[PDB]
Amino acid sequence: TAPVRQEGIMTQGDLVTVTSDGIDLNALWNSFAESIAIYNEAMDNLIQLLTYPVTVPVEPVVQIGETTFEEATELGVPRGAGLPIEVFQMGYDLRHYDKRNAYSWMFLADADGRQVEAIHDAVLWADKRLVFRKVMEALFDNRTRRANIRNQAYNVYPLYNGDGVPPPRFKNNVFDETHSHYVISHNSVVDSSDLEDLMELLAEHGYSPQAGTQFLLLANKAETDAIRQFRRGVVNNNGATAGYDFIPSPTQPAMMLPNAEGLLGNQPAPTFGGLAVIGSYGFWNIVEEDYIPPGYLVGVGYGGAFNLGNPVGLRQHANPAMQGLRIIAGNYQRYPLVDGFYARSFGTGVRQRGGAAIMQIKASGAYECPPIYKKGGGFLV
């Protein structure tokens, strides 16, 4: 709860005991558990909808050429044919994280078991927050990474970012190496045309409603309060005109309508995965949460003919003994100190670089990663 981080060898004087007033403070450690349970639920739903386990550490992509017929003649012969192919590869990184706890003998002699169980529970909470931060960094952090896999180095990619191999041609759409999914609105407030632009960044690659792709928009309340106002043919922020209505989910409060048939079509389903849907706009299902920072829109495509999966792969270590969160016996095991370690190894990357997009809502300049999910900013959300 409070952002205070006590770090040291736990001594007497760091002991928590029954008060002289008879208040057992060691009963109170797990009293936050329901405010934690809502943050825990929100992180669970985002992680299971944004991640998959990496089973293949390096992924290939290829570019193949073409040929043409020609019109025949009665004495000559047509031109020959051949295909040129080339290939590129991308991976997922892997890093190591650990924590210590340490106690003096005078602490261990007098401590209630509930005080050390509470410290263990705070470590599991920090572990989950570490995993969530690194998953969200894999999606928001615009920069390319490097990693060594089976004794060779690879690029580890976010979504398209103006770096790596260009997206493949789809129909009449062609892309160069500068192509990026991290674009900006070019205006201080969200438009309906921003939701249509963000949608076009997926549809340009054939990931589309017509191909059977489903669409999730994740947004802050600061954006959804504006999107709820969008009405077909009505002028909007920055002089945009809305092409659709915002249609409320069946969990929204009741409203009067100009017609006893209210809508042409259905209301959106109230949950997408485990996430709570407020409504829909065009082909977007809309989920609001402030784990998306203010001024950022995240659009994610699922399913369809291209089989869009969850955007971020989680790589664990290949050895099953190195997988999971693990407790290691410490270097001090006797007197006057005892210590021990917690350790986890994992890492992250994107396979299907076009399956999602991120828009920062601002007037000018390049996309900025929100500091909450910039790689160097720490180990907590």
Add this chain to the structure above:
Amino acid sequence: GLPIEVFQMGYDLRHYDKRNAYSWMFLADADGRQVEAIHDAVLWADKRLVFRKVMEALFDNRTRRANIRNQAYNVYPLYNGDGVPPPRFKNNVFDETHSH
């Protein structure tokens, strides 16, 4: 490590009272129905007391004190710019001046 800390709040307790007093020359001539009327008016004034103090507990903006088992506690209304700040929720952060 974890630095726990705790704060506490109680509920007050106050005494109230009314008298009925009669002279013998009243009770010599009085109908019992006249004193049963005054009893019923007290039973109504008791209800109006409980209701006033319940509504005051919610509408009166001020912090009170009460002695419980030889310690003095704060007795509170809703958040009112006084006492321990509301605990942080998500990205909402609160200070001592926060008021409902």
